[PDB]
């Protein structure tokens, strides 16, 4: 095809243009002509990929009117080629400024009136005074503008620290530094003739600092703003390990650098609601107090700063200028975020840009994507990761899976402290993450204005929904509320690649506005509408040939139709169905890029037997029917890592007709990559109690098991103990039935978490070696339990136990177990941080 | 079809050129060739956005032979613009090279030490403030407009015998627009020790610590931070200033009030020279020791008044008078052209100082500040009229949550805080009401906006500058005419590129009937018509063809109804019809105005039928008929913040006796954004006076109320006390009827200003619970009041009560309150700064 030829020439220009965008993004350009040049080529690049993906889809449909649509694509390619040719000619003067080719400003912090750091300084000073006799690093970690340097300078000037450490050196490390000037700066603290070392190498300069520091007692060295582990390695030569309890206090935005200097870094606190108000009040009114007319909007101002001292200091600058009237302060309270970033591009914007610009080029889009969700809202890590892959941000072709590559992208953001973690799974994996309010405003301002990554759709007080001229340039739409009325305007976005319904309350699509999304946005790759209840599938949903992510709630539909299989590019499938049976009639076995099938009903998979391929990318098959756990299905998914079965566990374990007792559970053991297995039972009216198949038929690589309502006997825990890799066991809704549970010796070699909900169990007995690696034990709503085994005190890995609706004798046994554990720790064993939690606290007085 | 595509091609070029102008305006280089390139590109850009706007209104009107001809004309005009764009790139390639690429001044200014006139009192005021104060480091920022004499006063303060005697060490520091903090610290160190060579490897952190040590060797220090421009610049320098509790002082000079407020919440705004002192300086600078000859004394005082007490203007004209010789005729010629000598012919001294504040202004604030020069010199600019003009011209670009009025008001606050715009009047709440630009800045605005950027051009008939011809009108962008409007309009002017027509005159003129349609005929692309100084006897069909109109203000004595064809101007934001008629009936389809923001009139406006769509941008409806305050009208306007009612308001407060509670006043309570409400009565022949509806019917977010001739009994004032957020209440004559005024306990929880005029009040009883926040209480022409309640003296927040020609008992009560308050202050009670003013001094003294 000649269209392929002009596409290939277009791709060559795209490689140059993308190289220009990457090169221009490596350093922030202050020239407006280059700013508009970057935006112009960034746009023509975006329309270029959208045009080629149209040709790719149309060529795929051609290989597997049609001619008129292909002709229209060719016309788009010709128009794009005319655009790139004029860019290379008219704007060539701007390209030459990027095809071919610094001030050290140490920060200034508060000396007097430091608010809320009285106990953080006390904690860190205690860690500086005590410890080993070797040079120990005490890192203070935090997000941009948290107050690390303010705390470090508070410690540096503390009366106890000054007396403790005879020699105190403050060194300003930064993103860029020269080791020679660092050593000469430290040398200048001690001797005035620094011209003495003009030709002395850095090797002997470091030994010179060794001599200066070792002449007295301890030394404390505050390495401010360390950004890399290489910087600490290169500078630490000057610091001798002469066994004098020497300390190196360090401040950094990087948790990975902090961990390598000390395995327990000191994460700095956020100011409380009263400390934020106290700080803002002091900054604005100085010694005087806030008049009562301004206290009400002022308190809201300090609470909207989310306890970040940088935001409170920046906002107080605007309040000082505006005045002391009530009306002005409510205007600020309604636009706290804008005052931080847009109105102040020199305090908050430049401080955040110090971390954003140091990001890798691929991680920048991942970080800005977190701003699509509402400010202060919890972002599920699994949801965020699946959106990154579906958007194309995760480009990777190594041995690992894309989930594990996007996960350490997120863990890199958390290490950089650009993303905060609110909940962690039992295995330590990130579960729920949230971006700070000012960083979120930076994500909004950068993505919507500077990069056109995504756009908010709203009609607030005065602003309205975007017009036809704006939607023609929009690439991603994120919307929280008023979705049905937004779609009632009949919008038309030709360049829209994603539609994120980030609203928290589930809405219902009217039957007339159900097909609005597929027609408004024909190039939709991502449709995150799990907060929307669709009652019907419309045929236009099956014309989204570019679709890769689709999440949707439903209350009525039961079957995914066969026309849904026309979307060969789909990766993630989330259908939160209120019903009980979800017959997936779509040909999901021909989606070579399919990765996840998540649902809550009993999904019935289509027939695998009859392209001659295998679903090598499919990783999750959650809550499918037990009838579909066939041998052919598990052959089609060699790389499955999570499996879920719901309903009729009776048919999962029943023996076959060939005489062998191994049932459908035997095929599950053939999944060599399986880590998570979930079994949920529904048929309480069945006359046959369920019996667990022997452990040699289980998947031997299973690391997490969840059972609900299965009515297994407690004697089957003995064969759950034979699993070599099981680490998390959660049992809910009397999944185990019986009044007595007596453990056999041994078993559970590496189980770490045991979660128990309501069951008719009354007695529990065990031996010393039953839980060699148990760390967390939880028991909820089991009012029939009499007592807990005393052998739990021998669990060396025990850290926390939670009991609800438990007997007082169980609390007494917990007290004895804790007391024995404390006695063991007093023999030299390190403390495990034992904790006990009984909810509600009003129970038992 | 392809014409719209060609508009996209032109728009792409316009984005590049607009960025070119934005980047070029960031650096005023000496390259003259680039100065002519930016002027040529700017003219093409202006002629391009005009052609694009012509295309926009043509497309809107179309969606027929005349339309086809106009479309062909637009296509030809666009083609000419495109061809002009190609000439820019073909010939001025080098000019674009200089801006897409990138790349002595720290000499302290000279100020006279001797012959300083008019600063004896101001210096003593600041000295008495430096000597006193607290025990920690206090800053005393002197702040004023460019050329005011801050450095002259600061050097005078720096050299008095009292300042020199009291302070241990005094240091002069010249901070500037751009400075290096390292050099400042090395200069302070250079004064204590001359061996500054030894700090080459010493970082700025240890330099600031060295300045701490040097200043801390003794007692007080006074440091004159000259010309500080930023909040950050003060923070980075104050780290070198020790705080040892010895009453250390810092004397800062700055053009920024917001920077001054941060250092001290009570900035010392420098005063302007009086008319006597201005003449004294001029005669001392021109004639030196010799006195002015008597023949030159009369013109000399005339030019001294032209400077408006600014020393910089006096110094500049002094050089002009020296060069121009000493003759009476020449001096009178200078007095007629003072502005020319300030800026046009002396760019060496005056213009550069003005440009220091101007080039630091953000790009959006530059056009906002230059627009303030359109109004006549010394004239008073209303703040609400100025703000609406900025929005109409497009200078305010905003997408956040605030309203465009609040953003533009913040722009006005930024200009005032930069001392580029004076504030002459302030509202009760402290909002800026009337502003005026200083004379030197007005001439700079006119020079920059006529001879450099072509923002606006004035029309006048002087000695040599007659009315401009057709060639000059072909380049005029905005028209500003003060007088001789009918004479200018009689010649049938033809300005096809005029975007504004500001009648900046003060006295109203009646437009001759035969010249009424001349304004719309002359400038078809009129975007702003500020004809509020012109009385129109009739509307014309030519007015309804100004499809680009956004701001329209006009006075009238004959027009009673706005015609329906007025609604053809869908772009209108502000609609002002100041009519002397009793009623105004708006037949125009104002609901179709999607961007309508303000409708203001003095008559009882009768709104048209609303018959889904919502006017989200409408903020003000001003005075309307009571019968039009329906729940349907308020549905279409949810963001209304000011409402006015005029006429027979008994149709508003009447009870719906049919059985429902749907009184027209109850619909007002459904407006959640209302903040100010006005009611004016016209009909007095009701059998009984009206009574207020219950307070829960009032809008809860109401913060200001105003009633006229409503004849409300004083008993129904306590219900106004149940308004939670009310802050200002004002009443004109006969708004309240009766002689006895009594209040319940509590009420008025947030009242701050109360206004009463010419009521029948004679007896007044109140309680301390009704005034928790009251600050202003005026009783103009309420001479029948006997005595003020004693509870008023207990109100801490009370500020001023002003009465003239009051009763003898009222004067005696004022004397008793003043005497008792003075006695209490002498006994240790904290003073509230309460003042009483009596004019003239013949009575009451
Ligand atoms: N407890 C506090 N009281 C008053 N001001 C504070 C406090 N903590 C921080 N600040 C102010 O907040 C701003 C940012 O704090 P700080 O300089 O310590 O940032 P940081 O966490 O070191 O920043 P970076 O991310 O650049 O390393 C500074 O202007 C500082 O004065
Ligand atoms: N009271 C005065 N008597 C005589 N000359 C004065 C007086 N005040 C100021 N001047 C003169 O006015 C001119 C400008 O004043 P000055 O240099 O003090 O300006 P400024 O307020 O510091 O301005 P900028 O905002 O540019 O810093 C100088 O030449 C100075 O000598």
UniProtKB/TrEMBL annotation, chain A:
GO terms for molecular function: ADP binding; ATP binding. Residues 119-289 form the NB-ARC domain. Residues 1-64 form the Disease resistance N-terminal domain. InterPro entries: Apaf_helical, Disease_R_plants, LRR_dom_sf, LRR_R13L4/SHOC2-like, NB-ARC, P-loop_NTPase, RX-like_CC, Rx_N. One of its GO terms (cellular component) is plasma membrane. Residues 373-442 form the Disease resistance protein winged helix domain. It is found in: Cell membrane. Pfam families: LRR_14, NB-ARC, Rx_N, WHD_DRP. Residues 495-808 form the Disease resistance R13L4/SHOC-2-like LRR domain. It is a peripheral membrane protein. Keywords: ATP-binding, Cell membrane, Coiled coil, Leucine-rich repeat, Membrane, Nucleotide-binding, Plant defense, Repeat. One of its GO terms (biological process) is defense response to virus. ATP binds at residues 110, 115, 145-150, 253. Belongs to the disease resistance NB-LRR family. This is Uncharacterized protein. It comes from Solanum lycopersicum. The gene is LOC101260638.
């Amino acid at each position: 095809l000649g269209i392929q030829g002009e596409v290939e020439n277009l791709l060559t220009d795209l490689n140059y243009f993308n190289a220009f965008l990457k090169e221009a993004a490596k350093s922030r350009r202050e020239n407006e002509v280059l700013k508009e040049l970057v935006k112009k080529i960034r746009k023509v690049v975006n329309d270029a990929e959208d045009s080629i993906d149209k040709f790719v889809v149309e060529a795929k449909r051609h290989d597997d009117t049609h001619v008129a649509r292909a002709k229209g694509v060719a016309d788009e390619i010709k128009s794009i080629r005319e655009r790139v040719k004029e860019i290379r000619d008219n704007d060539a003067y701007g390209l030459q400024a990027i095809t071919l080719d610094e001030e050290r400003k140490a920060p200034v912090v508060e000396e007097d009136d430091v608010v809320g750091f009285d106990d953080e300084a006390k904690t860190v000073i205690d860690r500086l005074i005590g410890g080993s006799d070797y040079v120990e690093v005490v890192p203070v970690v935090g997000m941009p503008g948290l107050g690390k340097t303010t705390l470090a300078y508070k410690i540096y000037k503390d009366p106890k620290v000054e007396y403790e450490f005879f020699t105190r050196v403050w060194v300003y490390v930064s993103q860029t530094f020269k080791r020679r000037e660092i050593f000469l700066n430290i040398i200048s603290k001690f001797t005035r003739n620094t011209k003495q070392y003009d030709d002395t190498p850095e090797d002997d300069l470091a030994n010179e600092v060794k001599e200066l520091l070792g002449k007295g007692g301890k030394y404390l060295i505050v390495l401010d703003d360390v950004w890399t582990m290489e910087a600490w390695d290169r500078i630490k030569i000057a610091f001798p390990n002469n066994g004098k309890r020497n300390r190196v206090l360090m401040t950094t935005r990087q948790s990975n650098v902090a961990k390598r200097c000390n395995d327990k870094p000191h994460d700095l606190k956020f100011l409380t609601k009263d400390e934020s108000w106290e700080l803002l009040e002091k900054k604005v009114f100085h010694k005087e107090k806030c008049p009562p007319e301004l206290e009400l909007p002022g308190i809201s101002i300090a609470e909207k700063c989310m306890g970040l001292p940088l935001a409170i200091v920046v906002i107080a600058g605007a309040l000082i200028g505006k005045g002391k009237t009530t009306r002005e302060w409510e205007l600020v309270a309604a636009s706290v975020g804008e005052h931080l970033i847009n109105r102040d591009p020199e305090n908050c914007k430049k401080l955040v840009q110090m971390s954003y610009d140091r990001l890798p080029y691929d991680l920048k889009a991942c970080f800005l994507y977190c701003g699509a969700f509402p400010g202060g809202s919890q972002i599920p890590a699994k949801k965020l990761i699946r959106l990154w892959i579906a958007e194309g941000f995760i480009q990777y072709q190594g041995p690992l899976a894309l989930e594990d590559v996007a996960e350490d992208h997120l863990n890199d953001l958390v290490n950089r402290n650009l993303v905060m973690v609110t909940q962690r799974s039992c295995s330590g994996q990130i579960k729920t993450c949230r971006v700070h309010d000012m960083l979120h405003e930076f994500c909004r301002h950068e993505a919507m204005m500077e990069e056109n990554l995504f756009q908010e759709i709203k009609q607030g007080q005065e602003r309205s929904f975007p017009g036809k001229q704006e939607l023609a340039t929009y690439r991603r739409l994120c919307i929280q509320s008023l979705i049905p009325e937004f779609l009632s305007m009949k919008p038309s976005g030709e360049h829209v690649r994603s539609f994120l319904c980030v609203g928290s309350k589930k809405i219902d699509m009217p039957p007339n506005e159900i097909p609005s999304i597929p027609k408004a946005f024909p190039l939709l790759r991502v449709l995150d509408a799990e907060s929307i209840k669709f009652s019907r599938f419309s045929r236009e949903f099956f014309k989204l040939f570019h679709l890769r992510y689709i999440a949707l709630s439903t209350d009525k539909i039961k079957t995914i139709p066969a026309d849904f299989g026309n979307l060969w590019n789909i990766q993630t499938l989330i259908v939160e169905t209120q019903q009980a049976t979800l017959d997936i009639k779509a040909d999901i076995w021909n989606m070579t890029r399919l990765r996840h099938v998540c649902t809550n009903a009993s999904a019935t998979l289509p027939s695998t037997k009859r392209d001659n391929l295998v679903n090598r990318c499919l990783q999750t098959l959650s809550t499918i029917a037990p009838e579909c756990c066939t041998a052919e299905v598990f052959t089609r998914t060699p790389n499955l890592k999570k499996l879920g079965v719901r309903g009729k566990i009776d048919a999962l374990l029943e023996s076959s007709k060939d005489g062998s007792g191994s049932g459908l559970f035997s095929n599950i053991g053939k999944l060599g990559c399986l880590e998570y297995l979930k079994l949920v039972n529904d048929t309480r009216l069945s006359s046959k109690p369920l019996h667990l198949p022997p452990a040699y038929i289980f998947p031997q690589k299973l690391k997490k098991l969840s059972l609900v309502d299965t009515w297994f006997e407690w004697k089957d825990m003995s064969i759950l103990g034979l699993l070599p890799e099981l680490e998390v066991l959660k049992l809910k809704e009397n999944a185990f039935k019986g009044q007595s549970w007596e453990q056999e010796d041994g078993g559970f070699p590496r189980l770490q978490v045991l979660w128990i909900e309501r069951t008719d169990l009354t007695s529990w007995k065990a031996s010393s070696g039953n839980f060699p690696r148990l760390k967390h034990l939880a028991l909820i709503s089991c009012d029939k339990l009499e007592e807990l085994p005393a052998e739990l005190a021998d669990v060396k890995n025990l850290q926390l136990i939670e009991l609800q609706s438990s007997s007082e004798s169980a609390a007494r046994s917990a007290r004895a177990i804790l007391k024995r554990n404390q006695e063991k720790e007093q023999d030299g064993d390190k403390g495990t941080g034992f904790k006990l939690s009984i909810f509600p606290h009003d129970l038992g007085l």
